[PDB]
Amino acid sequence: EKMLEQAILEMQEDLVQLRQGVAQAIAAQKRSEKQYNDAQNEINKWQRNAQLALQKGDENLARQALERKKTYTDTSAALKASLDTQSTQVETLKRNLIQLESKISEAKTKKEMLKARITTAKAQEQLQGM
Amino acid sequence: AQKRSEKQYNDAQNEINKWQRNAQLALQKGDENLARQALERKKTYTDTSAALKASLDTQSTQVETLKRNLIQLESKISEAKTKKEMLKARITTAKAQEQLQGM
Amino acid sequence: MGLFDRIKRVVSSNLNDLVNKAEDPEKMLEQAILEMQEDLVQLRQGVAQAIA
Amino acid sequence: KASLDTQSTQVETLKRNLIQLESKISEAKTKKEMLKARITTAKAQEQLQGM
Amino acid sequence: VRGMNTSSAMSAFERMEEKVLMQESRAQALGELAGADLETQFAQLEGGSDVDDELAALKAQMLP
Amino acid sequence: VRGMNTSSAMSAFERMEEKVLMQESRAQALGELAGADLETQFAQLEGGSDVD
């Protein structure tokens, strides 16, 4: 039972560390989303400027805006790709935490079962002494 | 340990009943997502309860043996006392025989 | 893996002695009620600043 | 209320236990007088028997 | 709200629960053993047996 | 109620019983031997014979 007691204390601290790690992953996804959102907003603003340029009649300004938009789109695409890869990793981490929660409860149940057999063995030893 | 598992099992059953009521309330509310989440929680709770039940059964067999051993021991100590009287008499007789040899 | 084996044995012995002295119902109960009330006041001040 | 009911049952059990204890101590007092009388007779008899 | 390990409320509940659970379990087990013993079992019957005869006697006693 | 080894009531009963049992047994055995002897046996008869 002592080994189980030692393990129970050890598992609890580890879970907290995992939660912090999960938060960082969550934060990273949020950070990418914020950047992606900013890019989309910037692209919309850029599109309006391009539309304004067409009304103005300055072809060169519009062309420059289009190039900027393309660069922004590429950055957005890269961010989107990163998010998808990150999401799969994040899901696994979330799944692991859920699995761990089920496992700790099981461990507590296991301790009770383990304790009873050990006690029975000790009782048998007492009989031998008699 | 058996009592502790039972208490946990009882708590889980109570929690499950409460969860079921919430799910029923959710259906009345019309929020499908809340009900689905509750069902998942109930399933997890059920699994924990099942594990606890399995542990209790294993524990009970061990517990019964321990209880049986104590009962057996109680019979044995009484027998030992009876044995002491019988053992004492033969030893005394042997000592008496030795005295005769000395004479 | 000597360190890991050593750590498990050392941790179990140390933890058991510490918890028994630590686990007193009367002492634990008195400390907890005072702490939560203090925490609420601090939280309120932060909230007040945001409100301000 | 739930807490009170559980606590009340425990309290009732404790009261019942006390009554049982009271019966036991009273019996013990009676036993000492009986035991002393038995011991005195045996001691007197042993000395007499040897002679 | 989440309940951190260092939080006072979470720690207090766990400590209180462990002490309470151990005391309650130990008392019940000891009590059960006392109940299990044969001496306790027929003592209750004796008390039950004793009162009914006394009640009949009491009625006779109170009759005149 | 259970009767612990350290309990005063349980210890007192056991100690009292051992002393009482030994004293009672020893006296009875010695008394029986005196009764067993022939001198005691016809002495009673002599007394009975003498009174009539």
Residue numbers in the entry:
A (entry chain A): 26 to 155
B (entry chain H): 53 to 155
C (entry chain B): 1 to 52
D (entry chain I): 105 to 155
E (entry chain DD): 156 to 219
F (entry chain B): 156 to 207
The authors write:
Proteins that perform these functions include Vipp1/IM30 in photosynthetic plastids, PspA in bacteria, and ESCRT-III in eukaryotes. Here, using a combination of evolutionary and structural analyses, we show that these protein families are homologous and share a common ancient evolutionary origin that likely predates the last universal common ancestor. This homology is evident in cryo-electron microscopy structures of Vipp1 rings from the cyanobacterium Nostoc punctiforme presented over a range of symmetries. Rings have an inner lumen that is able to bind and deform membranes.
Reconstructions were also generated for the other six symmetries and complete ring models built. Rungs are maximally constricted at the top and bottom with internal lumen diameters of 14 nm and 15.7 nm, and widest at the ring equator between rungs 3 and 4 with an internal diameter of 17.5 nm. This unique asymmetric curvature is a feature of all Vipp1C11–C17 ring symmetries. The analysis of different ring symmetries, ranging from C11–C17, provides us with a view of the structural flexibility that enables Vipp1, PspA, and ESCRT-III family members to perform their functions. Furthermore, as each ring comprises between 5–7 rungs stacked together to build a dome-shaped architecture, these asymmetric structures provide us with a glimpse of the structural features that enable filament tilt in the context of an ESCRT-III-like polymer. Consistent with this, Interfaces 1 and 3 linking the top two rungs were poorly resolved in Vipp1C11–C17 rings, indicating a weak interaction once the limiting geometry is reached. When membrane was modeled into the Vipp1C11–C17 structures as a 4-nm bilayer, sequential constriction was observed with the membrane lumen reaching ∼3 nm within Vipp1C11.
